[PDB]
Amino acid sequence: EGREDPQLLVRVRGGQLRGIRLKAPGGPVSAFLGIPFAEPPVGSRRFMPPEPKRPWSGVLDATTFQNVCYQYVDTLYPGFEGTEMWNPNRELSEDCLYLNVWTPYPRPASPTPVLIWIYGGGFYSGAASLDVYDGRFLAQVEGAVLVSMNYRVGTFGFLALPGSREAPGNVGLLDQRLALQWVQENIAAFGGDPMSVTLFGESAGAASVGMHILSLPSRSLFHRAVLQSGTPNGPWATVSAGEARRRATLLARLVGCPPNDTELIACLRTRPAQDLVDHEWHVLPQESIFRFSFVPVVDGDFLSDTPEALINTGDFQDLQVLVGVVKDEGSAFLVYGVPGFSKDNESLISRAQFLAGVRIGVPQASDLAAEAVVLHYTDWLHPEDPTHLRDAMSAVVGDHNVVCPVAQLAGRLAAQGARVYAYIFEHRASTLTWPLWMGVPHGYEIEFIFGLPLDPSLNYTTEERIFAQRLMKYWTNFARTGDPNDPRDSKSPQWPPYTTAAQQYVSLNLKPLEVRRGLRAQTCAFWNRFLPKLLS
Amino acid sequence: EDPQLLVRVRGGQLRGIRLKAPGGPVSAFLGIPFAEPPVGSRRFMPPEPKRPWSGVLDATTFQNVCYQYVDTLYPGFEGTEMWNPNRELSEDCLYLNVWTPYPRPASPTPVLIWIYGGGFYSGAASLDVYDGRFLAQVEGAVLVSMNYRVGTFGFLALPGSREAPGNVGLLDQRLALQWVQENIAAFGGDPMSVTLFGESAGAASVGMHILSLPSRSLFHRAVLQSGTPNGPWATVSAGEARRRATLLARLVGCPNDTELIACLRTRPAQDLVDHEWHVLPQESIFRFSFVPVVDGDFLSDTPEALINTGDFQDLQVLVGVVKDEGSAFLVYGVPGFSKDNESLISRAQFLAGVRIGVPQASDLAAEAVVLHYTDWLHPEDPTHLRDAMSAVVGDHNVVCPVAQLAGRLAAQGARVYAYIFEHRASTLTWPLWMGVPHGYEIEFIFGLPLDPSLNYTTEERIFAQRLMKYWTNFARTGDPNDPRDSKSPQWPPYTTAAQQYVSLNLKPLEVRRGLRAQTCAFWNRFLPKLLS
Ligand SMILES: Nc1ccc2c(c1)c(-c1ccccc1)[n+](CCCCCCc1cn(CCNc3c4c(nc5ccccc35)CCCC4)nn1)c1cc(N)ccc21
Ligand SMILES: Nc1ccc2c(c1)c(-c1ccccc1)[n+](CCCCCCc1cn(CCNc3c4c(nc5ccccc35)CCCC4)nn1)c1cc(N)ccc21
């Protein structure tokens, strides 16, 4: 240091860091990007839990995002903003276990509440460097400290041969936990309050947040949680030890590693990263959508039991949670598998195409259950309307994978001590490039919660700017206090907790808050109470 | 002697009685024999035509009510007794009543033939609510109604036997229908324009006549109010009918078909009635011991099958339901339900009543019903659970079978008009929570509110006049709409595409779509897959 900016030099337990002074619309912020929190999980260390990062010497440059964990890059629609905005924005490498911190500039006087973001991507994709996860607006506007970490995805993160030592499973979650430990020891260097850490995340990230709520060593690492369009319970976020075993073994076969677990994992470790990616979809048991090959396994360790059992019997008094869904959870999933669906036409389907989709949307379902789904979603006045069928198929996927799982997470949590706040996000970005029929797709609240509309250069409407400010007040009010409502405010409609008695939740859109009752109450009774029994 | 009151039917001469109706005199011919009394050796057998008589037969009063169980759940209560026999009980009961205008119509008039209900165990054409005078006087109709055997006497079957072949109560009705063809002309009635109408078990009978080829040449149009030949209660199979008869016979100490039937014939009628309730296979409501049987004769195949494959092109049908088909049945065996309180039930009591209301339901199937009918916002609210139990019973037994029948007839070329009846009679003595219970549209169709001595409101007098117009317009032309009155709005036909039906209430007609579609899809399409 000679002439460096005094506000950008900070020490953490691993050594010295140099951050960068970033411009936000309303002023500067400090970012420390690419801070290593683990030893690169490379070589003999692929599939293994992560080890703490060994201290370095000199000043580590933390001015730019680090590598993205090895993943499948989407190619369904080349050039298309709608998919590319989720694609990796840095080089892919197994050396990817880094985290990012944004804090006010100058760093705040007294300790600030900390928000830790966990990206989604079905446990097979995503990076904390994506433009929609930019911590600068929350940091600058709400005075918050914001952290996001990379964690291994796909085979690299979740390939398990359960009961073995060399590939125990759940190591992606263990990267996330390591980063939470890192925040406990280090966040105070940045002015963050380690005693007020809220986890938030979306899709698979939300599932992860809930898995930290259900895993005891994670509990002392955070104090509150927000789950956006995802849950640990439900059909896609976990697998039995058996199923994960079948998958690893199948993948092994596929890459030339025939099966003892040591021989097998070793052979997999000699395989090139890309080979594993190039083969990971092939191990899924059925033609299906909203199913991912390598996901958290119920190992009897990180997850002592299935998320369903753990939410049915855990005590949560104790715990404050904000949960919700977007209007159209299913729609955008339809174009990755259901015949008849495309982003480039209005996706009007036949009744045949619907029955056919239901079997892919609900792959575990017998003929009888498939009929039950179809019968429940048919509009009997117009059982042939292409437009209604299209919307039903979207609803089936949304309801089965997100809405109804969230619906019970909120149900069981509230009944067992938790203060729960629930929402449905109903605003379609004016700037969306997916077709109008898709409505408000899975993923499209994120840019509003992070404050992107406030970037004048991004072409959001004025209404949208104000809407994002509101939502940022909601999230950080929740982080700061466990109540998304503003104490200094006077109704200005209140966000009431979700209870089992009242089942209250709010609409999030451009209009002031509207309180509604019951998240798809009838329809979720179908998925959560009836359907299970049509497997039993 | 009044020449108007003298008629020559094929069996000989009759004397009727001139009755007083609000707006003018009507001629009535009550208690006309149409069959040989089905007594002694004729018990359980097809009726035979009545033998000619000498002189002038006195047809001025109602005849005996066919032998049946008499209700005593609430002795003295108008709400139950109004359905009870209002004449002496006898196996000698095959008589019919005719009302016509006075004077006898100048030209041939449309004929309505009423078939009463009462679960094939009860009923009589003589009940005040089936009084044909108002329709006769006001709409100029010729209205006929017949007694038919009920319970063991009408429906005890040992299928395949010569002696007790089953469905004889149906054959009674058919004999009455044949009697109308041969004789009604003499009363100024038009035999080429006969409309059958009937409610509850009466409705299923009409349904059965639609589905039986010999009955088809005896009428031209049909009205089924709150009942259908398909559904869980209106038919039994040959195997099950035989089981019940056999069991009943055992129960009265009757030890080969011929032998068994001979002994049953030697039995006082009240013995058979004493033991009829005891042959039902389960604790249940809306199931009746002795009902028509799928015989391969009168019914060539199950109604479900018959409606499925039949050709119903030139056929006009009027079908409908009341708002609260299920409520009144709940007090007849579902724990927690009483007429003398608001009947608010617990969830446990709901699951329990579902097993009684849907006696065939497996553990999983009942939970399906329970899960579909719960208010998930509500979901332990006693008012709801009570209403839902009423809804389960109505839907399962009437509404959804109606919806199913309306659907197949329309699809197969019939012309269908449908309604839901939503007005609760002001005179009703059943509790408010029962709403508009099974059976309580009849007084309106028959025009009873027009009798000022009955204390109906003025609104009701006007309402009943409208219904009388709908039904008799329907009888005259196959279309219930007033064919010279403009602005209405019009009662549109039921079609499978649009599914249009109307509400009959104090307000002017309102057209709705789907009766009552999500729920009937449940009953008609899902539940059956949960049996097989
Ligand atoms: N031919 C191949 C080869 C390999 C794979 C294939 C296909 C596919 C696939 C592509 C098109 C059609 C069918 C199948 N896939 C993709 C199937 C699953 C894709 C789901 C895409 C999706 C759609 N949405 C909703 C819309 N919003 C998002 C997305 C995406 N990511 C995110 C991340 C967080 C929140 C939202 C969001 C990415 C894509 C587009 C929209 N989320 N995720 C692969 C997947 C693997 N794990 C491994 C290999 C391959
Ligand atoms: N211990 C015994 C012995 C014999 C019988 C018993 C009980 C009962 C019974 C009474 C009370 C509670 C449980 C059982 N029952 C009664 C079971 C059948 C009761 C049906 C009641 C009912 C209710 N509704 C709806 C309301 N409106 C009506 C009625 C009644 N009839 C009609 C006829 C046409 C249209 C409407 C209508 C008669 C009763 C009350 C209301 N219709 N029918 C008997 C029946 C048999 N088939 C044979 C024997 C006996």
UniProtKB/Swiss-Prot annotation, chain B:
<keyword id="KW-1003">Cell membrane</keyword>
<dbReference type="InterPro" id="IPR019826">
    <property type="entry name" value="Carboxylesterase_B_AS"/>
</dbReference>
<dbReference type="GO" id="GO:0031623">
    <property type="term" value="P:receptor internalization"/>
</dbReference>
<feature type="glycosylation site" description="N-linked (GlcNAc...) asparagine">
    <location>
        <position position="256"/>
    </location>
</feature>
<keyword id="KW-0531">Neurotransmitter degradation</keyword>
<dbReference type="InterPro" id="IPR019819">
    <property type="entry name" value="Carboxylesterase_B_CS"/>
</dbReference>
<dbReference type="InterPro" id="IPR000997">
    <property type="entry name" value="Cholinesterase"/>
</dbReference>
<keyword id="KW-0732">Signal</keyword>
<dbReference type="GO" id="GO:0042803">
    <property type="term" value="F:protein homodimerization activity"/>
</dbReference>
<dbReference type="InterPro" id="IPR029058">
    <property type="entry name" value="AB_hydrolase_fold"/>
</dbReference>
<comment type="function">
    <text>Terminates signal transduction at the neuromuscular junction by rapid hydrolysis of the acetylcholine released into the synaptic cleft.</text>
</comment>
<dbReference type="GO" id="GO:0005615">
    <property type="term" value="C:extracellular space"/>
</dbReference>
<dbReference type="GO" id="GO:0005518">
    <property type="term" value="F:collagen binding"/>
</dbReference>
<dbReference type="GO" id="GO:0042802">
    <property type="term" value="F:identical protein binding"/>
</dbReference>
<protein>
    <recommendedName>
        <fullName>Acetylcholinesterase</fullName>
        <ecNumber>3.1.1.7</ecNumber>
    </recommendedName>
</protein>
<feature type="active site" description="Acyl-ester intermediate">
    <location>
        <position position="200"/>
    </location>
</feature>
<dbReference type="GO" id="GO:0017171">
    <property type="term" value="F:serine hydrolase activity"/>
</dbReference>
<dbReference type="GO" id="GO:0095500">
    <property type="term" value="P:acetylcholine receptor signaling pathway"/>
</dbReference>
<dbReference type="GO" id="GO:0005794">
    <property type="term" value="C:Golgi apparatus"/>
</dbReference>
<dbReference type="InterPro" id="IPR014788">
    <property type="entry name" value="AChE_tetra"/>
</dbReference>
<dbReference type="GO" id="GO:0098552">
    <property type="term" value="C:side of membrane"/>
</dbReference>
<keyword id="KW-0336">GPI-anchor</keyword>
<keyword id="KW-0449">Lipoprotein</keyword>
<keyword id="KW-1015">Disulfide bond</keyword>
<feature type="glycosylation site" description="N-linked (GlcNAc...) asparagine">
    <location>
        <position position="455"/>
    </location>
</feature>
<dbReference type="Pfam" id="PF00135">
    <property type="entry name" value="COesterase"/>
</dbReference>
<dbReference type="InterPro" id="IPR050654">
    <property type="entry name" value="AChE-related_enzymes"/>
</dbReference>
<keyword id="KW-0378">Hydrolase</keyword>
<comment type="subunit">
    <text>Isoform H generates GPI-anchored dimers; disulfide linked. Isoform T generates multiple structures, ranging from monomers and dimers to collagen-tailed and hydrophobic-tailed forms, in which catalytic tetramers are associated with anchoring proteins that attach them to the basal lamina or to cell membranes. In the collagen-tailed forms, isoform T subunits are associated with a specific collagen, COLQ, which triggers the formation of isoform T tetramers, from monomers and dimers. Interacts with PRIMA1.</text>
</comment>
<dbReference type="GO" id="GO:0045202">
    <property type="term" value="C:synapse"/>
</dbReference>
<feature type="disulfide bond">
    <location>
        <begin position="254"/>
        <end position="263"/>
    </location>
</feature>
<dbReference type="GO" id="GO:0048471">
    <property type="term" value="C:perinuclear region of cytoplasm"/>
</dbReference>
<dbReference type="InterPro" id="IPR002018">
    <property type="entry name" value="CarbesteraseB"/>
</dbReference>
<dbReference type="GO" id="GO:0005886">
    <property type="term" value="C:plasma membrane"/>
</dbReference>
<dbReference type="GO" id="GO:0120162">
    <property type="term" value="P:positive regulation of cold-induced thermogenesis"/>
</dbReference>
<dbReference type="GO" id="GO:0031594">
    <property type="term" value="C:neuromuscular junction"/>
</dbReference>
<dbReference type="GO" id="GO:0043236">
    <property type="term" value="F:laminin binding"/>
</dbReference>
<keyword id="KW-0770">Synapse</keyword>
<dbReference type="GO" id="GO:0001919">
    <property type="term" value="P:regulation of receptor recycling"/>
</dbReference>
<dbReference type="GO" id="GO:0002076">
    <property type="term" value="P:osteoblast development"/>
</dbReference>
<dbReference type="GO" id="GO:0042166">
    <property type="term" value="F:acetylcholine binding"/>
</dbReference>
<keyword id="KW-0964">Secreted</keyword>
